[model samples]
Target chain A: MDVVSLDKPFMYFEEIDNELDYEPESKLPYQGQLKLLLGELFFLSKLQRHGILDGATVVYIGSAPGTHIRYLRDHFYNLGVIIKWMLIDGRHHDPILNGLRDVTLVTRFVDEEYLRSIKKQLHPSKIILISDVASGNEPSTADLLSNYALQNVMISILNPVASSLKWRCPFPDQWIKDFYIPHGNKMLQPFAPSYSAEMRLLSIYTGENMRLTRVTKSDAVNYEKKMYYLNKIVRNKVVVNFDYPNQEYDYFHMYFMLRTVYCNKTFPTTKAKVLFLQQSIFRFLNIP
Target chain B: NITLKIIETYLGRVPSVNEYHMLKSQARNIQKITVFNKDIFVSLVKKNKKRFFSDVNTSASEIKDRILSYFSKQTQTYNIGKLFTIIELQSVLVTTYTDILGVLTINVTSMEELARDMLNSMNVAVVSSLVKNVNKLMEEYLRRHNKSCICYGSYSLYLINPNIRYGDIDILQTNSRTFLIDLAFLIKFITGNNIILSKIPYLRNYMVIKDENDNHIIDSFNIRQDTMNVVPKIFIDNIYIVDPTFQLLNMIKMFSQIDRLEDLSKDPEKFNARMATMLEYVRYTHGIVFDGKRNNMPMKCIIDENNRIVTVTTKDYFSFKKCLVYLDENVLSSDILDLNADTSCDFESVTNSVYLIHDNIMYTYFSNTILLSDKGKVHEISARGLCAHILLYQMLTSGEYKQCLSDLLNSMMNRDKIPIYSHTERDKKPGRHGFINIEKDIIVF
Candidate 1:
C-alpha cells in the first residue's frame, strides 16, 4: 500500500443545480461515532495485534448494537486470546451472541447492584475491558458509571453533533475530555445536495489523556481457500504467496514467481522500497 | 461510461471473485507507479518474476484498498451525480489474495440513469437506514398524536437514494407550539428505548438511533416552515405516508446559503454536488414549483463532468474583503459575542468565499455567513452570528432598518489593518470577538 498521507483529505462536500434536484432526509438523531470507532478499533487492534488486549474476561457493557462486540471478538479470537464475552444488556440480545465462542450474556438493567454482583464471578482487577456503555438513549446513566468507570472510554460522534454546537449532545458533558479524529473534518460527502451537508462520523476516545500513535499495519487476507484457480495455474513449487505473505519476500516475491516468469502481464518491483515511479504494469491478454 | 471503461482497461474479463481482486490490485499498482521507474520496472517484469521472484515496501492489499476506496469514491460521486448507468456486471472474481470484485459493463441511458442506479446502490446497499427508521418511528409518533409533518430535503429523491449516508434527514414538523411541546416530552420517553431525540435550537430536535451495530444514524427535525405547499404522500408497509411533495423552490433556496443574499445567485454550477442532486431529481423526478415560473427559475440543472464547482463568479458586486458579519443581535436582544440562540440570532452572513482564519493563511477555514434559524424574522433571534453583509443590504432594501443593522460597516471600515487583507499581527486577528474588517464589505443603510 502507498504511504498514508495524513493531510490527504478522505472526504469532501457533496451536491448541484438547475430548478434543482432537492430531496433531503430528516437529520434524525445526528449521531456519529463509527469512524471514531474505527479509529479506536485500529488503536485497539494494533494493541491486540501486538499482544496487548489479550484473552481475559473482557466485559463489554454495551452491546455496540452488538457489532462492536463482535468486531472486537474477531480480533481477540484470531490472536489466540480467547476471552469470555461477559456482555451486559437490558433486553435479550443474547440471540446476537449466536456463534461468538466463549461469550456469556447478562440480560438485566445496568442497575449498580447488578453490576457489582457480576464482580463475584468475574474479578474486576483481572481479565476485563469496557467500551463506554453504549448509550442507546440517555448518557447510559452517568451516576451508575460514577462508581464503575474506567480511566478512559470510547464514544463515537460526528462533527457539528458534538454538544459544543449548543445542540445539547446527550452523550456526555462538553468537558468529558474527548479525543476525536480530526481527519473526520476532511471527509466530505462529495455530491450530497446543496441542503444536504454530509457530516463525519467520529469515535471519540474520552479519557484523561487519550493518545493514538499509529503503527505500520499489515493486513493479511487468507487466500488458500479461494485460490483454487490460482493453484490450478501455478506450479506446486511456487505457492505464489498471496498472503502478500511476501512483504516477507519468498512471498512478496512469490507474486514474482508466477506472474513475472510465466505471464507477460507480469508486474515487477524490488525487494525493498515502494517507489511511486517504478510500478510494473500488466496486460489483459490471457497469461501463457 | 468512463468509469466502466477505466475499470475495463484495468480489469479485463472476470468471472470469479479472485480474478477481480488480482486485476484490481494489479491495476492499482500500475496506477501508483511513477514515471521514474516505469521503464526499469517494466524491464524487470519482462525479465520474469518466475526468474527473479520478489517485491516490497508495502502491502498490496493496502494499495488495493487505496485503489478501491478512491475508485468507489469517484464512481459513487459520479454515480450519485446521476451517472450510474449501471448496465451490466461482467462477472464476479475472487483473487488469490482473497479480495473480491465484479466487472461491470455500463450502458448509460443518460446521466440520470447512473444517478438512479448509484443512489439505489448507496441507499439500498450502503446508506444509513436512519431515514427509513425515522419515517417508521416518527410516522408512529405523528400518527399517534394525529399531527402532520412533511419531510423536506431530498424527500423527493429519498426513494432513489435511500442509501445516502450523507447529511441529516431534515424534516419539518407542521404542528404549532402546543403539539410540538408535547412531542418533545414524547421524545424523552422514546429515548429510553433505542433512539434518543434531543431538543436543539431553532425549535428543532436531533434524534440519534443505535442499531444492532453500535453505530448511530443522526437526523434532525424542525418545526419551522409553518406551512407547506405540497408534501409527498406515499404508502409504507401498506399504511399511509402523509408528507406531500418536496418543495423545489424552498428546498433549493434554503440551501443556497447566498441565494437569499442575491436572488439572482441561482447558478447551479456554483455548488457542484448540490446541482448534481438537482439533475437527478429533474431527470427522474420533476421539480415541485409552487408558482411555476420556469422563466424566473435558473436553468433546469447542469451536471458538469468532473463534478466540480465550475465557476465561482467573482463579480465586483460580491465582497472582496473578509470579516465577521455584524449580526451581533445580542447587543439589542442577546449576547454580542456568544450568538448562542435560536432564530433569535445574527443578521450577518457570507458566501463560501468568506473565511475565518485562526487568524492567518497558514491556518484558516472557509466559513459560511448564512445564519441558521427556525424563523428568519429579526426579533425572534436571540443572538446574531458572523454572516454575509449582503443579507444586511437586502434587509436594508426591504426597509430603512438602519438602526437594526449598522454597526455593520460602522466598526470594520475604520480598522487600520482591514481583515480582508492578510498581514495582521497575531493578537489583532479578528480575535475571538466577532469584530471584523468591513472596509470593502457593505452597509445596509
Candidate 2:
C-alpha cells in the first residue's frame, strides 16, 4: 500500500511543563492559537503519511464546513497533488470529534478546551496550526501573525479572521503606506524573508521578485547590500498585498509548485498519478 | 294142667287163665333150648363127626326130638317123670359122660349112682344140653323156611363158642365186610359184574386166583363154578411196600442215585474230551500235521530233539510256510513288548521274549509267551516273567478253577451298576487309577 506524503514540511517538536508562561490577558487567545497549531500539525502529519497534500485522500471533520479544504484542493491540483476531500456531516460532530480524539498518532481538536485536555498526550513531533478567523477582532494584525505562524509553524500564532479579511479587502492603500514606505535611509521589512538557506519567502507587489535574504552576523557587507537593494525598491513605492486574493493566489501557486516539485522529485519513478490541494483554492471555492 | 290148676287154686284165679300160663311157660323153655341147640349143632358140624350115633349127637338129638314132640303133641298131661329121666341122661352125657361111661362099662356104679350124679350135675350141664337142643330146632326151622344159611367167619366163631370173648367184633366184622365188599366191588366195578354168584365170564378167563395159603394154584378158570374171592399175596406184599413215606424216600433215593451215576459216568469222559481237544490244539499250534495227505506227524515226535521234519507232505509244508508268513507280518506290526511292560510284566526278559517272537515269527505277539500264529493258532510257550504266565498256567493246570474264575468274572461284569464312593473320589483327582499309576500289582492266584 502506498502512503500519502505532506508537500509542506510541517513536523515540529516542543517540550511542555506544568507552568503558566503567557500573560493573563493573552492566555485564552494563546491557548486558542495553540489548538489551531495542534490541528494543523495533526492534519499535516496524517496528510504526509497518506501523501494527502500531495494528491491523496483527506477527510475534514467539523460542524461548519471549512472553506480552506476546497481552496486547498483546487490550487493543489495544478501542483499534481490529487487531493480527495470529504466533509463530515455537521450533525455528527460530537461522534466524529470523539473518534478523532481517540487518534493516538495524528489527532486534531478544533475545540480549544477539548484540545487542552488532550494537549499533554499529543506528539510534539507532528503538530500544525490552522487559524480560526471568527474568534478575535483585529483582522490586519491577525493576517500578519497568521501568515507568520503559517511560515514558522513551530513558534507562531495563526489568526484566521485577519487572514480571511485580508483576502476580502479590495484596496491595498494602507499596506503600501505602512509596510512598503522606506524608513529614513533604511529598507522597510519585507513581508516574507529568507530565514535560512533551505527556506524562502516572496512578495506579491512587484513584478520583479525581491528575495528577503538573511546573513551571518559577520557578513555586514552582504547585509548592507540586501538592505540597499530593498531601499531602492521601496523608493518606487511597491505595494505588498498579504490580503486574501494575492495571498490566496500566492499560497495556491506556492502549494502548487511545492506539490509538483516534491511529488515529481519523490515519486518520479512511480506509476501512480500526483494530486495537490491548496487551502486558498478551498477557501475561494468555499468548500468544506 | 294140674300144676296150672294148683297155681290157680293157690291164687284163686280162673281155670282158663291158669291153662294159658302153663303154655307160655313151656314155650319159653323150648325157645331157650332151640337157640342153645343151634350152637351145639354148628359146633358138631364144624367138628366133622364121622360116626352117626356119637354120644354127643345122640344125646343132642334126643333132647331136640323130645322138645319137638312135646311142642308138636301139645300134651297137657305131660309125663314129668319120663321127661325127668331123659333130661337126667342128657345131662350125664353133657357134663359127666366119661365118668358115666366108665362106671357103666366097668360095673363100678349102678344106674341109681349114675342117675343120682346126673341129677346132681344137671344145673351145670343145662346150658350144653340147651345148646344141643337149639341146633335141632334151627335145623327144623331152616328146613321149614327152606332158606339157605350163611355162616360168616364171625358167625362160625359164634357157633363154635356160644360164650366166645366179646373182642372187637364190630370192628372185625366191619373190616372183614368192607374188604369183601371192596374186593367184590373192585372186581365188579372193574369188570362190570352184575350177577350175584354168577361166573364173570371175562374175569373167569383172566382173573387170577389163589388157594387158602394164597399160592397161585389156579391159573385161570372158566365159568365152571362160582368161587369165593381171596386176596393174593402179591397184592398184599405190594400194599405193605406202598406205604407213602417209604415209597417217597425210595423214589428220591433212586433219582439221586441215577443223577449221581450220570455225573459220575460223564466226569472222566468230559475231562478226557477236553484234554483231547486241548492236545489237538497244542499239536496244531506246534505244526503237527494230521491230514491224510500230510505226513500226519505226532506232536511229540515233531518236537523231538532233532527238530527235523521227519516226513513232510507238500501241502503240510505249504501250510506251515503260510503260517510263518502270517506270523512275520502280524508280529512285526504288534507292540507286544510295549504292552507287556504296560501290563506290569516289566521284567526285561519278558519284554525281550515278546520282541523276539515279533521279530522271529509270522504271528501277533500277545504276550511274552502267547502268540496268535499266522495259521490262527494260539501258541503258548513258557514266558520269562511269572506275571505273564500266572493266569494262563493256572488255567492250563485246573480247568475247574478256571471255570469258576470265568463264572465269577462274568457274573461281576453282567451285574447291575453299583455306585462306588472311592471311584467318585478318585475321579476328582488329576490322574485316574488305570491311566498312569503302576505302583500296586494286581495279584491273582
DockQ per candidate: 0.01, 0.00
Going through the candidates in order, the fraction of native interface contacts each one reproduces equals 0.00, 0.00
Model 2 stretches astray by more than 4 angstroms? A1-64, A70-115, A132-288, B1-445
Q: Look at candidate 2 and tell me the lDDT of residue B414.
A: 17
Model 1 DockQ class: incorrect
TM-scores of the models, in the order given: 0.21, 0.15
Over A142-235, each residue of candidate 1 has an lDDT whose tens digit, in order, gives: 4323422321221121111111000011122212322322211112221122222222222122122233321111100111111221222211
lDDT, candidate 1, at B212 = 30
lDDT of 1 at B93: 11
Model 1: CA > 4 A from native: A1-288, B1-147, B159-169, B174-195, B200-214, B224-277, B280-445
The CA lDDT at B328 in model 2 is 20
Candidate 2, residue B440: how far the Cα is off, in Å:
99
Best by DockQ: 1
- On residues B1-445, what C-alpha lDDT tens digit does candidate 1 reach at each position? 3333344443332223443332332333323321122233223222322221223233434333432332223233222111111111101111110111001000112333333332221121002343343444343332332223444444333433453233434444433222232222222222212322222221112232333343444343422121122223444433233322122222222322332323323432222333235444433433322111122111111112121111111122233222222221111111111221112111111111111222211111112222222232211011121212223322313433232122221221112211111111111111011100111111110
lDDT of 1 at B292: 17
Please report how far candidate 2 places residue A223 from its true position, in Å.
Answer: 18
